[PDB]
Structure 1
C-alpha cells in the first residue's frame, strides 16, 4: 500500500479489502472478527516511520469500506492515536493522518464527532508553521468539513488566531457558492 507503483498500491488496497472480507467468513460475529483483523495490524503503528505511515494509510482505506461495522467507540480510539501521530515530524505521517482525519469526518456520525471536535482540532491547531503552510489545502478542506458539520463559531472559538482568517475565508465561499 506504500509501494512505488500505483497499480501495486491499488492491488494491495483491494487485497486488504478482500482479506477483510475473508475474516468475515471465519467466525459468527463480524465485529469481533474485524477487531481481530485490526489487532493483527495494530503493531504497525509502533515500528518504523514509513511503517507508521503505511499503517495509517491502511487504516484510512479500511475505515472507508467497513464504516460502522468495526464499532464507533473503537473508531474514536484510533482517531485519538492519529492525533499523537499528528505530532510527527515526518511529512508523510502528517499527510496520512490528515487523510485519515478527512475520511473519519466523512464517515463518522456527527453526534459522536461532537465529543471529538475539540481534541482532534486542537491537535490540528498546534501543528507547526511549516506544516500549516505546506498542507494548507488539506487543513482548508478539513475546516470546511467541520464548518459544514458543526458550528462555525465553535471552531472559531477553539482555534488560535491565524486559522481564524482561514475559517472566515472558507465562510466567504459560503455566500458566493449560493
Structure 2
C-alpha cells in the first residue's frame, strides 16, 4: 500500500537499513528485489536514483555475507535473473537494473557470465517494444565500455548481427545509439570487419562515421543588461587648468575611450 511519490523516500529508508544489515536477513532482501527494480523504472528521477543506489549498496551488502565475492554476486544476479522472463515492462526494468549493475562491479561478475547475459540481451534486441530494445542497447553500450576487447572479439559478430536485423522504423528511431555503438566498435576493432558483416544501408552511416574519425584529428546595470600598445593609450580632460602636481589629478586622466518589437493598441509589447 505504498503510493507513487512515497517510493522516493522509502527506498532511502530501505537504503538506511542495508549498510548494517546482518547475515540472517536474506528473505527481506529477496522480498525487496522487485520493488527496487520497479523503482529503477519509477516515474520520479529521484526514486530511480535512490533505487540504483539501493541496488549498489545491496550488492555491497552481499559482499559481506560470504567468503567468495564472485559466488555471492552470482547469487545476487540469480536473484534478479528471473526478471528477464515475465511482463514486458518488468523485463525492461530488469534490463535497466542489470545495465546499472554491470557498470559498478565490472570484473566481479566474471566476463563469460556477462557474455551469456549479452547473448540474452541480443535476444532482447529482437523485441517489439521500444523500451526493451532501448534498455538492451544501453546494456550493450555498457558491456562494450566495460568488458574486455579480447572477450568482445569472439562476441562482436553475434551482437552486431542482432543489431543488423532490427527493423526499418526501429533503426530509424534510435539512430543515435546505433551511431554511438558503431563508433565504439570502429574505434575498438577494424572498420573493415564492421563493414564486412553489416548489411548494405548501415555501410553508408559507417563511411560517415569514418569521415568523422578523419575530422577528429561587473555589477552595473548596463553591463549586465548588455547584448552579449592598446592598453597604454591615455585621455586627458580639458574647467580649471589641469595641474599635474595636484594630488587629485588622476581623476582627470582616463584609461579608456570616453563617451525591437511592435507596440499594440493597448501598449503591451508583443513577444514571439
TM-score category by the smaller chain? Answer: over 0.9
CA deviations over 1:43-97 (Å, ceiling 9, x no partner) = 0100000000000000000000000011010000000000000000000001000
Between the two structures, name the one with larger relative contact order (CA 8 Å, sep ≥ 6).
1
Determine if the alignment matches structure 1 residue 10 to structure 2 residue 55: no
Distance 2:61 2:109 in 1: 15
Distance 1:168 1:52 in 2: 35
Distance 2:215 2:208 in 1: 11
Matches of residues 44-63 of structure 1 in structure 2 within 5 Å?
44-63=83-102
**Which is greater in Rg?**
2
Report how far residue 100 of structure 1 moved. Answer: 0.3
Distance 2:209 2:91 in 1: 32
1:30 alignment counterpart: 69
Q: In the alignment, which of 199, 202, 208 is matched to residue 160 of structure 1?
A: 199
Structure whose residues are more often helix by fraction: 1
Q: For structure 2, which runs of at least 5 residues remain unmatched after alignment?
A: 1-39, 218-272
Report how far residue 133 of structure 1 moved. Answer: 0.2
Report how far residue 125 of structure 1 moved. Answer: 0.2
Q: For structure 1, which runs of at least 5 residues remain unmatched after alignment?
A: none
State the 4+ residue runs in structure 1 displaced beyond 6 angstroms: none
Distance 1:103 1:117 in 2: 14
Report how far residue 39 of structure 1 moved. Answer: 0.3
Distance 1:71 1:175 in 2: 36
| TM-score, with length taken from structure 1 | 1.00
Distance 1:174 1:44 in 2: 39
